[PDB]
UniProtKB/Swiss-Prot annotation:
Regulation: Activity is up-regulated by PRK2/PKN2-mediated phosphorylation.
Cellular location(s): Host cytoplasm; Host endoplasmic reticulum membrane
Protein's name according to its UniProt entry: RNA-directed RNA polymerase
Membrane topology recorded in Swiss-Prot or TrEMBL: Single-pass type IV membrane protein
Parent-protein residues present: 2443 to 2995 of 3033
Annotated residues for binding of Mg(2+) 2: 221, 319-320
Cofactor entry: Mg(2+)
Native species: Hepatitis C virus genotype 2a (isolate JFH-1) (HCV)
Phylogenetic classification of the source organism: Viruses, Riboviria, Orthornavirae, Kitrinoviricota, Flasuviricetes
Function statement: RNA-dependent RNA polymerase that performs primer-template recognition and RNA synthesis during viral replication. Initiates RNA transcription/replication at a flavin adenine dinucleotide (FAD), resulting in a 5'- FAD cap on viral RNAs. In this way, recognition of viral 5' RNA by host pattern recognition receptors can be bypassed, thereby evading activation of antiviral pathways.
Domain RdRp catalytic: 215-333
Length: 554
C-alpha cells in the first residue's frame, strides 16, 4: 500500500562541517597503524542509504498480533503519567541541541530565557488548536565512525536522521517524556532491555537459559527498522500511549504530535529545500526508542505465538531481540524460526541476517554483543558481556580538530571492563596516554544513552568493581572464540598483537604504582593480569559508596 519515503531530488546536504582526517593522529597512532581503514559516514553517502530505505510496505496482521496488542494496552492502562512543565521539558534539552529557526538555541532553552519560553509556549498552543497541519522536519546524514569491511562492500552509507525544530522537541518532552520513563518498563517488565547494566544483562540471559529444560535461543534484528514502521504502527503506538491514565491536555497534544509529526511529514535538507515526504518512523523524535521497542515487542511476541515458540523469554532493545525458549527438537526449531520470520515479515519487520536456532549461549549475538565465559585462576566459570572490538578500535582512532577519541576509550573501559581487549589494549593505551599528558586526575565524560556522567580516571577501579565485581580484575582464561576474534580484530587494524600489549601494560603498571596514591591502586587492580605473581585484591570501600543506577538505564 504505502511507500516509506518519496523524494523530490534535492540532495541530503551536510549540517555544517564534515571533518577531514589529519596526516598525524597523535593520540592513536601508537594504538593501531591502519588508519586508512577508519572512516566516517558522510552526507554524500546519504543518497545510497535513501535508495536502500525506500520501499513499499505491505503489512498484514492476524489474530496473534491482535491478541498481543490487547494484552499490551491492558498493561499500559496501569500507568499514570503527568505532563511535564514547559520549564522541565526545557531543561531536559542537551546543552548542544540543534538550534531553532526562531533565533534561539539550547543555551536559552536550558536557561529558561524569555524569548525561548515564549516561542515554545506558542508552539504548544498550536499543538492543541491544530490537530492536522504537518510539522516540517529536517533530514541529515548521521556521522559515525566504522572500520572498512571489504566483505560487506567497503564503507557503509550514512543513516538518515529526521527531526523537528527545537521548539517542537521541547514540546514532545512535555507531552511524552513521562511516558517514555514508565510505559516501556510497564508493558514489557523484565523483557525491557535498556534497564540492565552489562553484568545484569548477563544475569538475565543466564537465568533464562537455565530455567529452560532444553534451552534454545535466537537473536533477531529488523532491516532498516525505521523505514519498516507503517503509518498504522505509529497510530497503534498512539493508542498504546492513550491506554494510560493521562490528563486530557496531554491526550490532545499526543494525538496532535502523532498525526502531524509521527505518522509522517515533509522533510527539508539543511539548505532549506524540500527534500522528500516521509510515511514512517522519523529517527529523531522523542518516541524513537520507546516506539521502536514497544512496536518491536508487539510484533516479536505475536510472531512467537505464530511460530509456536514454547515458553519464550525475551530481551528487547530497540529492534534487537533475544528469545530463549524451550527447544522442540532441532528439526522443529528450524521450522519454527522460519515461521517467526515469515510472520515478522508479514508484520513489516523483515529481517537483516536471517535468524537461526542456537544451543550455546556464546553463539547468540544481539545488541552488538554476546555473553562469553572466562575462568578464574582456580577454574571457576565467570560469565560476562563482550563484543567484536573492531568498531570500538576504529572509534578509538577517530581523532580530528573537533573530536577527541579519549571519551570513546573511557566508555569502552567502563562498559566492557571484563573483556580481554579492554583489559589488555584499551586500558593499557588509556593509562599510558594520560600519564604522559599528566592528566590522570582530570575528569572525563562518560557518554551513555544520551546522558553524560563525569568520571575521574583514577576512580576506574572502584567504578569497575561496582559494575562488574572483582571478577573483572581476575579473568584468567578466555574462550577460543574471544581469543580468535580479538587477535583477528587487532591484525585487521594494524594494532600490536596481545603479546606486545602485555609488555606495554607491565610498563604502564610500573609507572602507575610508582606515583603511588590512587594511581597505584589503578596499577594494582587494573593490571594484575600483567604480572607473574598476582596480588590478592580486596573489595574497595569506595565502591560500596557508588550509585551508578542511572548509567545503564533510560
Ligand atoms: C534512547 C537512546 C538514545 C541514545 N542517544 C545517543 C546520543 O545522543 N549520542 C550518542 O553518541 N549515542 C546515543 N545512543 C547510543 C548509545 O549511547 C550507545 O552507543 C549504544 O546504543 C549502547 O550500546 P549497545 O550495546 O545498545 O549498541 P547497539 O548494538 O548499536 O544498540 C542496539 C539497539 O539499540 C538501538 N539504538 C542504537 N543506537 C541508537 C541511537 N542513537 N538512538 C536510539 N536508539 C539506538 C537500536 O534500536 C539498536 O538496535 C542512544 C541510544 C538509545 C537507546
Ligand atoms: N534518533 C536516533 N535513532 C537511531 C539511531 N541509530 C539507530 N536508531 C534507531 O534504531 C533503529 C534500528 O537500529 P539499527 O541497528 O541501526 O537498524 P537499521 O535502521 O535497520 O539499520 C533504527 O532504524 C533507529 O530508529 C540514531 O543515531 N539516532
Ligand atoms: Mn538493529
Ligand atoms: Mn535493524
Amino acid at each position: 500500500s504505502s511507500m516509506s519515503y518519496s523524494w523530490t531530488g534535492a540532495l541530503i546536504t551536510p549540517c555544517g562541517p564534515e571533518e577531514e582526517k589529519l596526516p598525524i593522529n597523535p593520540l592513536s597512532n601508537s594504538l593501531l597503524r591502519y588508519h586508512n581503514k577508519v572512516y566516517c559516514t558522510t552526507s554524500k553517502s546519504a543518497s545510497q542509504r535513501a535508495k536502500k530505505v525506500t520501499f513499499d510496505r505491505t503489512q498484514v496482521l492476524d489474530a496473534h498480533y491482535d491478541s498481543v496488542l490487547k494484552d499490551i494496552k491492558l498493561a499500559a492502562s496501569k500507568v499514570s503519567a503527568r505532563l511535564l512543565t514547559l520549564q522541565q521539558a526545557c531543561q531536559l534539552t542537551p546543552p548542544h541541541s540543534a538550534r531553532s529557526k526562531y533565533g534561539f538555541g539550547a543555551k536559552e532553552v536550558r536557561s529558561l530565557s524569555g524569548r525561548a519560553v515564549n516561542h515554545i509556549k506558542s508552539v504548544w498552543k498550536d499543538l492543541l488548536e491544530d490537530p492536522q497541519t504537518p510539522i516540517p522536519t529536517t533530514i541529515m546524514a548521521k556521522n559515525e565512525v566504522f572500520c572498512v569491511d571489504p566483505a560487506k562492500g567497503g564503507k557503509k552509507p550514512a543513516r538518515l536522521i529526521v527531526y523537528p525544530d527545537l521548539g517542537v522537541r521541547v514540546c514532545e518532552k512535555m507531552a511524552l517524556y513521562d511516558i517514555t520513563q514508565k510505559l516501556p518498563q510497564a508493558v514489557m517488565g523484565a523483557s525491557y532491555g535498556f534497564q540492565y547494566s552489562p553484568a545484569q544483562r548477563v544475569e538475565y540471559l543466564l537465568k533464562a537459559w537455565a530455567e529452560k529444560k532444553d534451552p534454545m535461543g535466537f537473536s533477531y534484528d529488523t532491516r532498516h527498522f525505521d523505514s519498516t514502521v507503517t503509518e498504522r504502527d505509529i497510530r497503534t503506538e498512539e493508542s498504546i500511549y492513550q491506554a494510560c491514565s493521562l490528563p486530557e491536555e496531554a491526550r490532545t497534544a499526543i494525538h496532535s504530535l502523532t498525526e502531524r509529526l509521527y505518522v509522517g511529514g515533509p522533510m527539508f535538507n539543511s539548505k532549506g529545500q524540500t527534500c522528500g515526504y516521509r510515511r514512517c518512523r522519523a529517527s529523531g523524535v522523542l518516541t524513537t526508542s520507546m516506539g521502536n521497542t514497544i512496536t518491536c515487542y508487539v510484533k516479536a511476541l505475536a510472531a512467537c505465538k505464530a511460530a509456536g515458540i514454547v515458553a519464550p523469554t525475551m530481551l528487547v532493545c530497540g529492534d534487537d531481540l533475544i528469545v530463549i525458549s524451550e527447544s522442540q527438537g532441532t528439526e522443529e526449531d528450524e521450522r519454527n524460526l522460519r515461521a517467526f520470520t515469515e510472520a515478522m515479515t508479514r508484520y513489516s519487520a523483515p529481517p537483516g541476517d536471517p535468524p537461526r536456532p542456537e544451543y550455546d549461549l556464546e553463539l547468540i549475538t544481539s545488541c552488538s554483543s554476546n555473553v562469553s565465559v572466562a575462568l578464574g585462576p582456580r577454574g571457576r566459570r565467570r560469565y560476562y558481556l563482550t563484543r567484536d572490538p573492531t568498531t570500538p578500535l576504529a572509534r578509538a582512532a577517530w581523532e580530528t580538530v573537533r573530536h577527541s577519541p579519549i571519551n570513546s576509550w573511557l566508555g569502552n573501559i567502563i562498559q566492557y571492563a571484563p573483556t580481554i581487549w579492554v583489559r589488555m589494549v584499551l586500558m593499557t593505551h588509556f593509562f599510558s596516554i594520560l600519564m604522559v599528558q599528566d592528566t590522570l586526575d582530570q575528569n572525563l565524560n562518560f557518554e551513555m544513552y544520551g546522558s553524560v556522567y563525569s568520571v575521574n580516571p583514577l576512580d576506574l577501579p572502584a567504578i569497575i568493581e561496582r559494575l562488574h565485581g572483582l571478577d573483572a580484575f581476575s579473568m584468567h582464561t578466555y574462550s577460543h572464540h574471544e581469543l580468535t576474534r580479538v587477535a583477528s580484530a587487532l591484525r585487521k587494524l594494524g594494532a600490536p598483537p596481545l603479546r606486545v600489549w602485555k609488555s606495554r601494560a607491565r610498563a604502564v603498571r610500573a609507572s602507575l604504582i610508582s606515583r603511588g596514591g590512587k594511581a597505584a591502586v589503578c596499577g594494582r587492580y587494573l593490571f594484575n593480569w600483567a604480572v607473574k605473581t598476582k596480588l590478592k585484591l580486596t573489595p574497595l570501600p569506595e565502591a560500596r559508596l557508588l550509585d551508578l543506577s542511572s548509567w545503564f538505564t533510560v
